[PDB]
Amino acid sequence: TPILTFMNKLDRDIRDPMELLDEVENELKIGCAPITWPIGCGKLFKGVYHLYKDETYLYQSGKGHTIQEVRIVKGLNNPDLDAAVGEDLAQQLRDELELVKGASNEFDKELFLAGEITPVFFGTALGNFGV
RNA sequence: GGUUUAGAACGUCGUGAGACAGUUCGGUCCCUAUCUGCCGUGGGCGCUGGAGAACUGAGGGGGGCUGCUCCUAGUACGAGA
Numbered sequence A: 001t002p003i004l005t006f007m008n009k010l011d012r013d014i015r016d017p018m019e020l021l022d023e024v025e026n027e028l029k030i031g032c033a034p035i036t037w038p039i040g041c042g043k044l045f046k047g048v049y050h051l052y053k054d055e056t057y058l059y060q061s062g063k064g065h066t067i068q069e070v071r072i073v074k075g076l077n078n079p080d081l082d083a084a085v086g087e088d089l090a091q092q093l094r095d096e097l098e099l100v101k102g103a104s105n106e107f108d109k110e111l112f113l114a115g116e117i118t119p120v121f122f123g124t125a126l127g128n129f130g131v
Numbered sequence B: 001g002g003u004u005u006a007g008a009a010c011g012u013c014g015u016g017a018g019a020c021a022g023u024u025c026g027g028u029c030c031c032u033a034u035c036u037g038c039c040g041u042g043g044g045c046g047c048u049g050g051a052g053a054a055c056u057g058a059g060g061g062g063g064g065c066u067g068c069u070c071c072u073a074g075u076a077c078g079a080g081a
Helices: A017-028 A079-085 A087-103 A109-113
Strands: A005-007 A031-034 A036-039 A047-050 A055-058 A117-122
Touching: A005 A017, A017 A031, A017 A087, A017 A117, A036 A087, A036 A117, A055 A079, A079 A087, A109 A117
Parallel strands: A005 A117, A031 A117
Antiparallel strands: A036 A047, A047 A055
16 A cells, blocks of 8 residues: 655654654665655744645635745756845755755656555644645 | 629629629710921012023932733653652
8 A cells, every 4th residue: 555655843843854764664674755854943943845846835824714825936057046045045955855866756646556665755744834 | 895883684703882804785985277297279588680481410209019811841850640
């Protein structure tokens, strides 16, 4: 049976999402294919950058009861991602994404249906963001 | 209202008058503020020619309480709660 993976609780101070990928591949014996990627966590959760759509959905704090306003920032090197997220966090997104590409997987529909890779989504079910 | 006067009764002590830091019902609380003090409010004279305004500010006084909710965030902390 195929497995989607959702990394919940990005409102909280969490572990390194890199390390989180290791624990999922190593201990669950299944490949990880990131679809989105968190930008900051805890008090610094700013949203997720979508790897395949190449855009950035911006998290707003405490709209967990309804659906928040979908607020996108288009480019991964769009200088508005720097403005909206702070250029510091913006580069760490860029850095991590570099490492991610050298140590992860492209989502393949065939291997997902074979139960050999999981599409990993990062989000927060409480903030109603990522769902 | 209590309690300390005078009336009356109970228990109680005493032959008794009376008595009890025992109880019970009743039972006159004056003052026109001279001074100090304090709240206000004027008059005088001063401040150096006499006036009409507007000021500066040495000082002085007043004020100074706090609940609950929401954002942060059900975040940090926490196995959870």
